[PDB]
Write a protein that holds these residues in place. Structure first.
Motif, PDB file in Angstrom:
ATOM      1  N   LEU A  92       0.821  -1.217   0.000  1.00 16.57           N
ATOM      2  CA  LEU A  92       0.000   0.000   0.000  1.00 16.57           C
ATOM      3  C   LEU A  92       0.858   1.271   0.000  1.00 16.57           C
ATOM      4  O   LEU A  92       0.330   2.384  -0.134  1.00 16.57           O
ATOM      5  CB  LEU A  92      -0.922  -0.012   1.219  1.00 16.57           C
ATOM      6  N   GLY A  93       2.171   1.091   0.135  1.00 13.07           N
ATOM      7  CA  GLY A  93       3.122   2.205   0.208  1.00 13.07           C
ATOM      8  C   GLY A  93       3.040   3.020   1.487  1.00 13.07           C
ATOM      9  O   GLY A  93       3.469   4.173   1.522  1.00 13.07           O
ATOM     10  N   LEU A  94       2.508   2.409   2.544  1.00 14.54           N
ATOM     11  CA  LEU A  94       2.274   3.086   3.825  1.00 14.54           C
ATOM     12  C   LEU A  94       3.320   2.803   4.914  1.00 14.54           C
ATOM     13  O   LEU A  94       3.329   3.463   5.948  1.00 14.54           O
ATOM     14  CB  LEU A  94       0.892   2.709   4.360  1.00 14.54           C
ATOM     15  N   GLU A  95       4.205   1.834   4.687  1.00 20.04           N
ATOM     16  CA  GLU A  95       5.199   1.481   5.703  1.00 20.04           C
ATOM     17  C   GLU A  95       6.336   2.504   5.701  1.00 20.04           C
ATOM     18  O   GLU A  95       6.763   2.969   4.633  1.00 20.04           O
ATOM     19  CB  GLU A  95       5.777   0.068   5.465  1.00 20.04           C
ATOM     20  N   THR A  96       6.824   2.851   6.888  1.00 19.66           N
ATOM     21  CA  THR A  96       8.039   3.655   7.010  1.00 19.66           C
ATOM     22  C   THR A  96       9.253   2.874   6.483  1.00 19.66           C
ATOM     23  O   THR A  96       9.214   1.644   6.401  1.00 19.66           O
ATOM     24  CB  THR A  96       8.324   4.065   8.472  1.00 19.66           C
ATOM     25  N   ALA A  97      10.316   3.601   6.131  1.00 26.83           N
ATOM     26  CA  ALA A  97      11.595   2.983   5.749  1.00 26.83           C
ATOM     27  C   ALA A  97      12.086   1.976   6.789  1.00 26.83           C
ATOM     28  O   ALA A  97      12.542   0.882   6.428  1.00 26.83           O
ATOM     29  CB  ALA A  97      12.654   4.054   5.512  1.00 26.83           C
ATOM     30  N   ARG A  98      12.008   2.348   8.070  1.00 24.01           N
ATOM     31  CA  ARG A  98      12.463   1.480   9.167  1.00 24.01           C
ATOM     32  C   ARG A  98      11.642   0.192   9.230  1.00 24.01           C
ATOM     33  O   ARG A  98      12.203  -0.896   9.354  1.00 24.01           O
ATOM     34  CB  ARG A  98      12.398   2.214  10.522  1.00 24.01           C
ATOM     35  N   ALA A  99      10.321   0.318   9.129  1.00 24.81           N
ATOM     36  CA  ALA A  99       9.434  -0.843   9.151  1.00 24.81           C
ATOM     37  C   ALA A  99       9.682  -1.752   7.946  1.00 24.81           C
ATOM     38  O   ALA A  99       9.710  -2.977   8.088  1.00 24.81           O
ATOM     39  CB  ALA A  99       7.972  -0.418   9.209  1.00 24.81           C
ATOM     40  N   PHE A 100       9.883  -1.151   6.772  1.00 22.50           N
ATOM     41  CA  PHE A 100      10.225  -1.919   5.574  1.00 22.50           C
ATOM     42  C   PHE A 100      11.540  -2.688   5.739  1.00 22.50           C
ATOM     43  O   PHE A 100      11.612  -3.884   5.415  1.00 22.50           O
ATOM     44  CB  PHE A 100      10.248  -1.024   4.313  1.00 22.50           C
ATOM     45  N   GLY A 101      12.567  -2.013   6.258  1.00 22.69           N
ATOM     46  CA  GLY A 101      13.882  -2.644   6.490  1.00 22.69           C
ATOM     47  C   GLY A 101      13.847  -3.790   7.485  1.00 22.69           C
ATOM     48  O   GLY A 101      14.565  -4.785   7.336  1.00 22.69           O
ATOM     49  N   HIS A 102      12.998  -3.664   8.496  1.00 23.47           N
ATOM     50  CA  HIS A 102      12.789  -4.749   9.446  1.00 23.47           C
ATOM     51  C   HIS A 102      12.153  -5.947   8.753  1.00 23.47           C
ATOM     52  O   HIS A 102      12.594  -7.079   8.952  1.00 23.47           O
ATOM     53  CB  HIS A 102      11.922  -4.297  10.616  1.00 23.47           C
ATOM     54  N   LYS A 103      11.139  -5.689   7.918  1.00 19.73           N
ATOM     55  CA  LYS A 103      10.446  -6.751   7.179  1.00 19.73           C
ATOM     56  C   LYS A 103      11.393  -7.466   6.230  1.00 19.73           C
ATOM     57  O   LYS A 103      11.391  -8.704   6.145  1.00 19.73           O
ATOM     58  CB  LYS A 103       9.250  -6.180   6.394  1.00 19.73           C
ATOM     59  N   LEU A 104      12.209  -6.676   5.531  1.00 13.53           N
ATOM     60  CA  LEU A 104      13.141  -7.211   4.539  1.00 13.53           C
ATOM     61  C   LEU A 104      14.211  -8.073   5.213  1.00 13.53           C
ATOM     62  O   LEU A 104      14.428  -9.222   4.804  1.00 13.53           O
ATOM     63  CB  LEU A 104      13.787  -6.078   3.732  1.00 13.53           C
ATOM     64  N   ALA A 105      14.851  -7.537   6.248  1.00 15.82           N
ATOM     65  CA  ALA A 105      15.892  -8.304   6.965  1.00 15.82           C
ATOM     66  C   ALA A 105      15.325  -9.566   7.591  1.00 15.82           C
ATOM     67  O   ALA A 105      15.927 -10.645   7.498  1.00 15.82           O
ATOM     68  CB  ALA A 105      16.565  -7.446   8.022  1.00 15.82           C
ATOM     69  N   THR A 106      14.158  -9.436   8.219  1.00 15.20           N
ATOM     70  CA  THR A 106      13.533 -10.560   8.894  1.00 15.20           C
ATOM     71  C   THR A 106      13.189 -11.690   7.913  1.00 15.20           C
ATOM     72  O   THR A 106      13.434 -12.862   8.205  1.00 15.20           O
ATOM     73  CB  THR A 106      12.321 -10.101   9.741  1.00 15.20           C
ATOM     74  N   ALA A 107      12.650 -11.333   6.747  1.00 15.88           N
ATOM     75  CA  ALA A 107      12.355 -12.316   5.703  1.00 15.88           C
ATOM     76  C   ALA A 107      13.620 -12.993   5.177  1.00 15.88           C
ATOM     77  O   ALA A 107      13.629 -14.197   4.967  1.00 15.88           O
ATOM     78  CB  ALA A 107      11.590 -11.663   4.542  1.00 15.88           C
ATOM     79  N   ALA A 108      14.668 -12.208   4.957  1.00 11.15           N
ATOM     80  CA  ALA A 108      15.936 -12.738   4.461  1.00 11.15           C
ATOM     81  C   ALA A 108      16.488 -13.790   5.440  1.00 11.15           C
ATOM     82  O   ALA A 108      16.930 -14.875   5.047  1.00 11.15           O
ATOM     83  CB  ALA A 108      16.914 -11.603   4.251  1.00 11.15           C
ATOM     84  N   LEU A 109      16.425 -13.468   6.721  1.00 13.81           N
ATOM     85  CA  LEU A 109      16.891 -14.400   7.753  1.00 13.81           C
ATOM     86  C   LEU A 109      15.981 -15.613   7.879  1.00 13.81           C
ATOM     87  O   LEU A 109      16.454 -16.732   8.023  1.00 13.81           O
ATOM     88  CB  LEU A 109      17.021 -13.672   9.089  1.00 13.81           C
ATOM     89  N   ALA A 110      14.663 -15.386   7.834  1.00 16.35           N
ATOM     90  CA  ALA A 110      13.708 -16.470   7.903  1.00 16.35           C
ATOM     91  C   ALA A 110      13.996 -17.508   6.811  1.00 16.35           C
ATOM     92  O   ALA A 110      13.911 -18.697   7.057  1.00 16.35           O
ATOM     93  CB  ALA A 110      12.290 -15.930   7.785  1.00 16.35           C
ATOM     94  N   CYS A 111      14.345 -17.016   5.623  1.00 13.64           N
ATOM     95  CA  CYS A 111      14.712 -17.835   4.469  1.00 13.64           C
ATOM     96  C   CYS A 111      16.009 -18.633   4.699  1.00 13.64           C
ATOM     97  O   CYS A 111      16.088 -19.819   4.371  1.00 13.64           O
ATOM     98  CB  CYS A 111      14.843 -16.934   3.234  1.00 13.64           C
ATOM     99  N   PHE A 112      17.011 -17.970   5.272  1.00  8.57           N
ATOM    100  CA  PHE A 112      18.300 -18.582   5.593  1.00  8.57           C
ATOM    101  C   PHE A 112      18.085 -19.704   6.620  1.00  8.57           C
ATOM    102  O   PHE A 112      18.600 -20.819   6.467  1.00  8.57           O
ATOM    103  CB  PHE A 112      19.241 -17.503   6.171  1.00  8.57           C
ATOM    104  N   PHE A 113      17.310 -19.408   7.669  1.00  8.03           N
ATOM    105  CA  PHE A 113      17.050 -20.382   8.721  1.00  8.03           C
ATOM    106  C   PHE A 113      16.232 -21.582   8.216  1.00  8.03           C
ATOM    107  O   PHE A 113      16.499 -22.706   8.615  1.00  8.03           O
ATOM    108  CB  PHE A 113      16.360 -19.754   9.929  1.00  8.03           C
ATOM    109  N   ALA A 114      15.251 -21.337   7.343  1.00  9.88           N
ATOM    110  CA  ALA A 114      14.453 -22.437   6.777  1.00  9.88           C
ATOM    111  C   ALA A 114      15.318 -23.338   5.893  1.00  9.88           C
ATOM    112  O   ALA A 114      15.141 -24.564   5.866  1.00  9.88           O
ATOM    113  CB  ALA A 114      13.249 -21.898   5.996  1.00  9.88           C
TER     114      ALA A 114
END
Length: 121
Positions: A92-114
């Motif tokens: 929706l383009g409503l997330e802050t830069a910080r919130a987006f970066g948290h989502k991106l890093a968290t997904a990247a790690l979730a993928c590594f761990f899986a």
């Protein structure tokens, strides 16, 4: 462009790699080491859209033996790939830069761990 990122260390037994790193490095250093590789792997998944099928998060500790740690970092991404990331994590383009970066890093790690779990580490 430079994307600012943040993530929490996983709970014990989520990641054999992380659990071994913290025998010798701080939780912060250990997570940063993993994230470097995880974000490299993830970039290639952004390029082809396969990242949308990847896990979004992972278990974090809830023990008196573990205090709150949020690790902060930045990394350069091609603008094309970040557009692809934002379309998905910020539809929706409503997330802050910080919130987006948290989502991106968290997904990247979730993928590594899986991937760790699926390959018997």
């Amino acid at each position: 462009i430079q994307v600012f990122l943040s993530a929490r260390p996983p709970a014990p037994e989520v990641s054999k790699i992380y659990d071994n790193l913290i025998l010798q490095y701080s939780p912060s250093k250990s997570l940063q080491m993993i994230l470097r590789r995880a974000l490299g792997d993830f970039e290639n998944m952004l390029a082809d859209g396969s990242f949308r099928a990847a896990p979004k998060s992972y278990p974090i500790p809830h023990t008196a033996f573990e205090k709150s740690i949020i690790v902060q970092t930045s990394r350069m991404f091609p603008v094309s790939l970040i557009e692809a990331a934002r379309n998905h994590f910020d539809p929706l383009g409503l997330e802050t830069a910080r919130a987006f970066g948290h989502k991106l890093a968290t997904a990247a790690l979730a993928c590594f761990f899986a991937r760790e779990k699926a390959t018997n580490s």
